[PDB]
Paper text:
Candida boidinii NAD+-dependent [name] (CbFDH) is a homodimeric 82 kDa enzyme complex that catalyzes the reversible conversion of formate and carbon dioxide using NAD+/NADH coenzymes for electron transfer. Here, we present high-resolution crystal structures of apo CbFDH determined at cryogenic and ambient temperatures, as well as as that of the highly active [name] mutant of CbFDH at cryogenic temperature. The inherent capability of the enzyme to catalyze the conversion of CO2 to formate holds significant potential for reducing atmospheric CO2 levels.
In CbFDH, residue 120 (Val120) is a potential mutation site for studies aiming to create a more active enzyme variant as it is located in the catalytic and substrate-binding site. In order to observe the effect of the [name] mutation, we determined the structure of the mutant CbFDH at 1.9 Å resolution and compared it with our wild-type structure. However, a closer look at the mutation site revealed new hydrogen bonds that does not exist in wild-type CbFDH between the threonine at position 120 and three water molecules. In the mutation site, nonetheless, we observed three new hydrogen bonds between Thr120 and water molecules in the active site. These new hydrogen bonds may help to stabilize the active site, leading to greater activity. The reason for the increase in substrate affinity may be that threonine is more polar than valine, so that it can form hydrogen bonds to neighboring amino acids or water molecules, resulting in higher stability in the substrate-binding region.
Author numbering:
A (entry chain B): 1 to 353
B (entry chain A): 1 to 356
């Protein structure tokens, strides 16, 4: 079978770290395994254009492997041209780039899977890191040192402990609940959450969480807010100027879920005005972020409150090892005809939800 | 009575934040309370040189309040001249700037007290923050965004999860244990600790910690090491070239305790060579760190691995409130003649150590 793998070019960075499996140079560490079992592997980062390397190999590709950090868009047209396509695998988590709705409509027996759970701890750690970074004002503190300054008062005037703070998550799924778990020993005033379904009682009481029915009541009482929800009609443009006006004045906001859940200019304006003390996370919209994206230069009145990073929280070397092992297991379940997939990895089973 | 309060000058920052109590401008929030009680408060940042305002008022100061973040050095020489000195307060935690040995060995009737416990959470959080920042390679990632760049592989190639890492603390005192407590839900491979005395079994089990008998074996198996111990003859220069040669290659090191525990040049060499992936923390030697201190410019082979900040972890606004309240309570105990100090706050009571 022909398998087409789409990843970014790490370039020199691939030679620096052999564990950087999620690039074209290292091919998820499975090129030998596929060759061993008689399959042909097409690896490429060229995913745009009509003469992209991807598009030339779509017509007879049995399997297509993708990644959210260099997403090959499985479009309506490409689905039409993929005459031998049987399986689309996400070497990671996230299927925004796959036209799942169209695949289902065609009736084609195309399975789509992702390595569910491989990213959650990595993103959850990133939220708490970013919470602590903002609350404790780490970013301007490190800037003083590397700039050869020493002025404690300029850093302490807007630095707090995370203890005694009320923290709320919008969404309490795999990532959000793992964020709550890690926050318990920091002794927050309270942990709050809003979600379209209740946490199990035992899970709720393990972290001492209280559920808030609506999002104004949630944010209005929250010192820290973190976004851990899927992107859909309810959450698209959720964090806009109107909703931000009900945040506690000087709140800290963190979003590692999806940039589009916020309205970029509204968030930036809120930080500049003081409605937010700081904003952080690693997701953007558009993504990758243009050089002019307002979240790059936005700052609070003190020249701080920005803890943004590129979208990399879910591609740490430990996540990538899970991505590569998970993709191999999914491929193995397919090659052997057992189709013994993990139930949580299935997005579509032979075209069906 | 005359109280001499020594804090740093915050300048404009004091105007920006009234809750910045630990500076000369806001006087720990107790200026009016002391005035209402009939006491004379001398507040100054000038603490160096015989001509200093501090030295001018030492001879008839009844109480001296100090802070570790702008330490007035209560030396033997100054104690001899403090003819009326009855009480030395630390608006915070840390008493290395006070010559306790001279007070206790002469028998001078001077009490020294600190606001015990008020810094522990703040420092413990800052260790975890630094651990996460170094392990996940945050600094160069954020640097990319503010420099209008986007190259994920340049960051991912040295970014890890703190999950599944072995974390060792040198010292399991108040801060060391609170670091371990905050690490439990991050699912480390194991929490290890070294100390001159063992934790209680219940404390060990609560955080799943294992004691390693000697430093060399502790650091050899640790992905992450954090220093949470006092500076004494057993820890001065502990993190030096040899001990670093026995760290797990590519280890991350955090030190929020005392700069002098490390040999600064040795740590930077270990970071440049790759013995250490990163180094972070907020304590320096000398302190304040001069502009050419090696820890300011040092980096790993990727231009990253530096999570250094100025010494501020224990002076957040929440801690500063605990310091100010704690100082007021100590003074109230002194003014009323009750001397009902919190037992944990006593370093010396009338020049004598007391049972802990």
């Amino acid at each position: 079978m022909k398998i087409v793998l789409v990843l970014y070019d790490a370039g020199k960075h691939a030679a620096d770290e052999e564990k950087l499996y999620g690039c074209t140079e290292n091919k998820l560490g499975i090129a030998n395994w596929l060759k061993d079992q008689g399959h042909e592997l097409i690896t490429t980062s060229d995913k745009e254009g009509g003469n992209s390397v991807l598009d030339q190999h779509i017509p007879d590709a049995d399997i297509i492997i993708t990644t959210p950090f260099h997403p090959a868009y499985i479009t309506k047209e490409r689905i039409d041209k993929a005459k031998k396509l049987k399986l689309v695998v996400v070497a990671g988590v996230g299927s925004d780039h796959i036209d799942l709705d169209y695949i289902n409509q065609t009736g084609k027996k195309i399975s789509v899977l992702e390595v569910t759970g491989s990213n959650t701890v990595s993103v959850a750690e990133h939220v708490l890191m970013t919470m602590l970074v903002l609350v404790r004002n780490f970013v301007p503190a490190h800037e003083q040192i590397i700039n050869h300054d020493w002025e404690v008062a300029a850093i302490a005037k807007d630095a707090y402990d995370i203890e005694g703070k009320t923290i709320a998550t919008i969404g309490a799924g795999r990532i959000g609940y793992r964020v709550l778990e890690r926050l318990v020993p920091f002794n927050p005033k309270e942990l709050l959450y809003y979600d379209y379904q209740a946490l199990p009682k035992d899970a709720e009481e393990k972290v001492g969480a209280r559920r808030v029915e609506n999002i104004e009541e949630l944010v209005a009482q929250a010192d820290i807010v973190t976004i851990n929800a899927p992107l859909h009609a309810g959450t698209k443009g959720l964090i806009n100027k109107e909703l931000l006006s009900k945040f506690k004045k000087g709140a800290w906001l963190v979003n590692t879920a999806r940039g589009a859940i916020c309205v970029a200019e509204d968030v930036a304006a809120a930080l500049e005005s003081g409605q937010l003390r700081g904003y952080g996370g690693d997701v953007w919209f558009p993504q990758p972020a243009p050089k002019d994206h307002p979240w790059r230069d936005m700052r609070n009145k003190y020249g701080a409150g920005n803890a943004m990073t590129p979208h990399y929280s879910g591609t740490t070397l430990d996540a990538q090892t899970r991505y590569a092992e998970g993709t191999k297991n999914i491929l193995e379940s397919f090659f052997t005809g057992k189709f013994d997939y993990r139930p949580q990895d299935i997005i579509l089973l032979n075209g069906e939800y």
